[PDB]
């Protein structure tokens, strides 16, 4: 690895290969080979556009006792989960998702941003998950969610998904999977060459 960040041999000839273009970068094989370079260029942040939360629900859960909803009161809801998303500047937004059982196989989910101190607590249903005769999610698996505006950064709106969520006689409500496509800025830590020839920077 020379001073200009190119992969060269002992004599200085530059190694060539298919370059990566786009966001997220992928190898475009339709282009002519170009010299391979490894810049330190900090990686910018990606505001979230798609988030997913797969969860399993208990059938035997009783309905919340203390109507109405309060994000402060624990006994006011059945479950609470946290998903970390990222805005245009990479700031962390901690979406708290609240599960309240309304009727049989019907679960209202509320969304509240806890990272923004001036955000109002939701009072109306964000979505109503409907589970069929046996866990099988029926409707309401996808909802548009808008972040708060924190420290002048652009609020990131995204589609949050509950696909493949199930509601059966599970012992308790616990989160199975949470994923999101956003990330915060990062600096180059390492580089490697895979057995398929791809150069990957971590």
């Amino acid at each position: 690895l020379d001073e200009n960040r190119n992969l060269v041999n002992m004599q200085g000839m530059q190694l060539t290969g298919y370059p990566a273009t786009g966001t997220p970068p992928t190898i475009q094989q339709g282009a002519n080979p170009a010299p391979i370079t490894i810049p330190n260029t900090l990686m910018a942040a990606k505001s979230t556009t798609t988030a997913s939360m797969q969860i399993n629900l208990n059938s035997t859960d009783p309905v919340p006792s203390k109507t109405p909803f309060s994000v402060s009161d624990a006994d006011s809801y059945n479950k609470k989960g946290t998903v970390t998303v990222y805005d245009s500047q990479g700031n962390a937004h901690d979406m708290n998702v609240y599960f309240v059982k309304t009727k049989d196989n019907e679960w209202a989910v509320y969304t509240h941003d806890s990272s923004d101190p001036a955000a109002t607590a939701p009072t109306t249903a964000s979505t109503t998950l409907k589970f069929n005769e046996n866990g099988i999610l029926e409707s309401g698996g996808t909802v548009n969610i808008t972040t708060g505006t924190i420290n002048g950064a652009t609020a990131a709106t995204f589609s949050l998904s509950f696909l493949n969520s199930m509601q059966q006689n599970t012992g308790a409500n616990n989160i199975v999977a949470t994923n999101q496509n956003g990330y915060k800025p990062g600096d180059l830590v390492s580089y490697q060459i895979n057995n398929d020839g791809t150069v990957v920077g971590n």
């Binding site: 690895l1 020379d2 001073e3 960040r5 330190n40 600096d187 180059l188 830590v189």
Partner: protein, 99 residues
């Protein structure tokens, strides 16, 4: 100090290079940055792209004696093979001159 108070006198800076193989060794276990190694990127231990510092310890050399001995044997054999080639050319030239 003796007054149940401490002071900070300095912070050791670390240097990282784009091309480690480009550093020209000046002896006395000391390296100098040149054109091939690029400019030194300065920072602190444990932040950015720098490893932390171990106190009360020293880093030994990474020279394994077994590999060095085996490579010495192989290189000796290669040297003797090249000497045999030289002897072959010597005999060829002697044969031609004796004509």
């Amino acid at each position: 100090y003796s007054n149940e108070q401490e002071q900070v006198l300095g912070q050791i800076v670390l240097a990282n290079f784009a091309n480690n193989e480009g550093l020209a060794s000046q002896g006395d276990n000391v390296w100098a940055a040149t054109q091939a190694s690029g400019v030194a990127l300065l920072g602190t231990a444990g932040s950015g792209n720098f490893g932390k510092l171990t106190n009360g310890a020293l880093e030994a050399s990474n020279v394994d004696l077994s590999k060095e001995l085996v490579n010495m044997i192989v290189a000796q054999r290669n040297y003797q093979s090249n000497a045999q080639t030289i002897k072959t050319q010597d005999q060829i030239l002697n044969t031609l001159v004796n004509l």
